[PDB]
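Protein modeling request. Please complete all fields; requests missing the sequence field cannot be processed.
Requester role: graduate student
Desired output: 3D structure, token encoding
Chains: 1
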Amino acid sequence: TDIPERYQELRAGITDYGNMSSEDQELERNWIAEKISVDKNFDANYDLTEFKEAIGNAIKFITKENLEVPFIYAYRRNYISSREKDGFLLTEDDLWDIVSLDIEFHSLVNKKDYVQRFYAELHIDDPIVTEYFKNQSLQDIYDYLEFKYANEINEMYEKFKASPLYQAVSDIGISAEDVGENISSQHQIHPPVDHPSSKPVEVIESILNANSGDLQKLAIDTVQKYYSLELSKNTKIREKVRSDFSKYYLADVVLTAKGKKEIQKGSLYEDNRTPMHFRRDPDVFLKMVEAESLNLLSVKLHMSSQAQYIEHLFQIALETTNTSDIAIEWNNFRKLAFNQAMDKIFQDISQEVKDNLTKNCQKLVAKTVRHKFMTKLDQAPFIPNVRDPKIPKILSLTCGQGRFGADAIIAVYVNRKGDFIRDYKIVDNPFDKTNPEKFEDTLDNIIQSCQPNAIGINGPNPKTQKFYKRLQEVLHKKQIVDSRGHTIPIIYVEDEVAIRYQNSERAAQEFPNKPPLVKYCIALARYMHSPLLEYANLTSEEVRSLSIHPHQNLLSSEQLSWALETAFVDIVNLVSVEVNKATDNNYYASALKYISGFGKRKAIDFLQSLQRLNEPLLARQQLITHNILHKTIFMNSAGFLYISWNEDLEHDQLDSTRIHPEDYHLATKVAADALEYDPDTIAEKEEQGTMSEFIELLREDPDRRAKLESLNLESYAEELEKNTGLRKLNNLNTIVLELLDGFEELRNDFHPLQGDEIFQSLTGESEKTFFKGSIIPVRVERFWHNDIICTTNSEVECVVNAQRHAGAQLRRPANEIYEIGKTYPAKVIYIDYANITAEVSLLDHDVKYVPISYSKDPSIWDLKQELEDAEEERKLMMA
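Delivered output (879 residues):
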């Protein structure tokens, strides 16, 4: 039970997880180190022993100490890095790779040992099988044993061999094992033996009538079908074919009935592919596999030289020089059984390599989706002032449907606490030329009443730009400034979460009698306060259906959910969680399940335990003294949870700092050194147990900077390791760093929406539809003094220049030319995402054609097939 929830739920499948030997541990270490070294791209030896040592330390911390990756990277960082800076470093990604490799390695060795425990279960000692298990295709070994010792395993071809027909196989003059040994040995150590006196046909014709009881050309077909099985079962052959196949196979796409029919060469399926090529575009293979799953196209996997690879492994191994017809007949039977067995094995080996690639690429895409979600999460709370930042007073509002003077503008005010105070409604039209001052006055009255510090806006359509511009100019006109004396900043903010929130039931129970716009503005404000909490609050299916990566749907729920969980774990462990708030601010506490060493089963227990205590925690030790936590859980998480300090003397500064309890003593000792206490007073105070006085004396003095930074971290850390043996330089650095000011913000600055993303979020037209130099139908709606004003399908404003439609090219205005109701195709020439406007050409000169195309190399892309199918495209209409 004292095991991290994520590890517990992961280990639910495997069994005997901790059962590993010294040889297993070394093989695992060297292998995982090789895998990471390969991805790290080292040069020469690179002092590889130090790297493999760091790997050993990491795997020890993970597998045996049950430490989660955040704690390891935070407090155990120095053991996973070169003593010299920039030598090497294993990132969070590497640690997650390590844990994944660890679990798969344990499951693999478990199956390997199970087959060992099945072979030795028979107690037979075979030169091949016993040698094979020396090192530790496993399923090949299982099939080999079930085929070879079908009866020895019974107490613990099958029918064909019972009939006399096996005499033909016996008469072959060489066993399949001889050929397999030659192949694996790469040389003909076992030449075949000639058959001198009887052809297979003589045996068949003689036996069929003479053995009317056991045997009856169906007999020959039966022999051909069953003998090749022995060829297909040889491990030494299959292993070599499989390996060579997986090194350079080709994966050209083959279409079906829907090919070029359901795609219309106008979709993502518009694409001799190779495994290495997928290293850059691994999603392409997912597209291929998905199209195959939906019965669109089937990717065919084959070797570079299938015919040469098979025959070159046969003429050198089985060709017969005997001119006797018997030898010719037998050699032909060898060739037929050989090639048929090869064709039989190819389907299985293909499925094996196919699934292997599917898994590898799924993980590779999971990595990128994770990293993007990560950069979405790492966003500090917005700061209203860089000079003197304080929590900001916020007033959120939404443009609505954009119908100024209608669909009354909704606004909401939220205090620094993040609590909904009051929603407003400005029905006065900001654009009514009659009395604009009406709107400007009522708005100023709102600001005067709430005195907010920031304004956020996001709407469904481009009208939001006009709304924002008006708001900005009105603010400038009224000279609205904070006590800071400068104008209130106005920023465009993301709203995806706000849209999901207002539709979500949680918002309904939170605000049962409020319109959707109010709840949306509320979510916008909250997003302005803490994006981490917002993303955390989303539910499993809703966050999964969040548009994070275009091909996110390719990954199944397990891989995507796991990848997302890793990001929440990292980012939550990047900034501490105030347990005091976590006991009651359920919205703020729900992130606890992602804190290091917590989860569903234990989050509930922890929260309930705090409720039972009915008092605020005063020191981290209380979590263990009252037995609230268990040793492992506390070790894995005590460094992240924190207590906010105030000012009662029993409380400790360290309880408001992200220092693990293990380094509290170190903190006091280094503070003592930074205080230049006399060695004798150090010993006396220590024997007296008066360490806490040191940090208070440090807090008292004003020359904190001049005294603290004077300390050389390197000397202290080197002496610490020399005397104690530990390695904590970076930890000591974090100590001294946080000893200045508690809980400095680590997340990067807020990310206001700028340009492109503004237009994208406010319009809903993808760059595949509305881009520089696109042809799109436009709705000519208004005529101007010289130009024409049109609109797109998503209310995008487009200007048709007098000359861009031959209006200025000829005489007279064109207003009489164009009419409403007819769809006019046009070509956009310029786009201004910042200004949300475009310039379009309405002339067939350009408006009258394949802007998109993948690779067209005849090998990468089959141009021959496309050219042949061009006649189908021509005839398809009449076909």
